[PDB]
């Protein structure tokens, strides 16, 4: 067991191994806050998240077990993984706080588009990386379901990572598939591809595609572009009968190869939307499309999800996961 040290940051105390140094807050993450730190064991900059009251609420123990389960399973270049997980507690009886750590990324796509324009080469590569992540994630039966620009971490080298997947406010409404926002069906994995559509269009243009003002306006903006629901549609669960825009006419000056993909992703009927694995092979990504480098995740056990156990068992399950953690090859 390494020696820890304490220090208060945004008015809470952090207890970390000596290896992580010069800890500095960088904002909020899912159910906690995160610091950028220097790892004196490896020489790399890392991001450290300390989760909030992990075993206070019942959801919290479940939410805390859930994240650490997902983060221990995700091993992919475009998907945030765990370099390390630690707690200051020396046995289960004092197990109270949990810290997660990952490679430090410099920005998220919200900050990028808010300070630059982006070429077709940029959106080519960025979008590419998201659906490689999504292929991997979807392949383990995990849905992001809240995919949005602030959930996409990026580097100075244009490298992208998905985070906060499988864990699920005002901003987030813009990228949600319609059937989810308004509880139309049971949600399948393509829900994320809708978000991908919204993001790609917003990366190209610089402006949010469907900035709906409330639940009602959102649909109006939705239907304004993609058209009214076709034949089936209502057979899968009263306003103006708008027609479907020819996407080429909206995204002027775009690579026509890019708009054809946008057309395939922003299809109202979930059954019709393109899939991540499908979307990868399309010709817009032909420059980066490499079937021999687009891997699938190992099977991942979600059995605990249907399970109703006590917080002390959830806590023991997480502590078990913390203890069993095997750091990656240095």
């Amino acid at each position: 067991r390494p020696t820890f040290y304490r220090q208060e940051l945004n008015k809470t105390i952090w207890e970390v191994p000596e290896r992580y140094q010069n800890l500095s807050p960088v904002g909020s993450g899912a159910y906690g806050s995160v610091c950028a730190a220097f790892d004196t064991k490896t020489g790399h900059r890392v991001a450290v998240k300390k989760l909030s009251r992990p075993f206070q609420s019942i959801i919290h123990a479940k939410r805390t077990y859930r994240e650490l389960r997902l983060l221990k399973h995700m091993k992919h270049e475009n998907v945030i993984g765990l370099l390390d997980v630690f707690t200051p507690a020396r046995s289960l009886e004092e197990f109270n706080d949990v810290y997660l750590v990952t490679h430090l990324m410099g920005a998220d796509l919200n900050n990028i588009v808010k300070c630059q324009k982006l070429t077709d080469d940029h959106v080519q590569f960025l979008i590419y990386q998201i659906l490689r992540g999504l292929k991997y994630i979807h392949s383990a039966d995990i849905i992001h379901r809240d995919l949005k620009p602030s959930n996409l971490a990026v580097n100075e080298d244009c490298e992208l990572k998905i985070l906060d997947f499988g864990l699920a406010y005002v901003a987030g409404r813009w990228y949600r598939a319609p059937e989810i926002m308004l509880n139309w069906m049971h949600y399948n994995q393509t829900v994320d591809i809708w978000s991908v559509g919204c993001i790609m269009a917003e990366l190209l243009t610089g402006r949010t595609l469907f900035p709906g003002t409330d639940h009602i306006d959102q649909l109006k903006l939705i239907l304004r572009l993609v058209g009214t629901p076709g034949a089936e549609l209502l057979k899968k669960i009263s306003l103006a009968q708008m027609p479907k825009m020819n996407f080429a006419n909206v995204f002027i000056g775009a690579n026509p190869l890019a708009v054809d993909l946008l057309e395939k992703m922003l299809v109202l009927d979930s059954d019709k939307r393109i899939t991540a694995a499908q979307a990868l092979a399309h010709a817009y990504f032909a420059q980066y499309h490499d079937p021999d480098d687009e891997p699938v995740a190992d099977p991942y056990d979600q059995s605990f999800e249907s399970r109703d156990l006590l917080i002390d068992e959830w806590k023991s399950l997480t502590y078990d996961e913390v203890i069993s953690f095997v750091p990656p090859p240095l």
């Binding site: 410099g106 920005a107 900050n111 940029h122 100075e156 269009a201 243009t205 000056g253 775009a254 890019a258």
Partner: peptide, 19 residues
């Protein structure tokens, strides 16, 4: 409404500026 691209499509390594 139509939405044109930030940089119009033109018919070799990528980077972004960090905040």
């Amino acid at each position: 409404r139509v939405y044109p691209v930030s940089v119009p499509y033109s018919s070799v390594t990528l980077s972004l500026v960090m905040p």
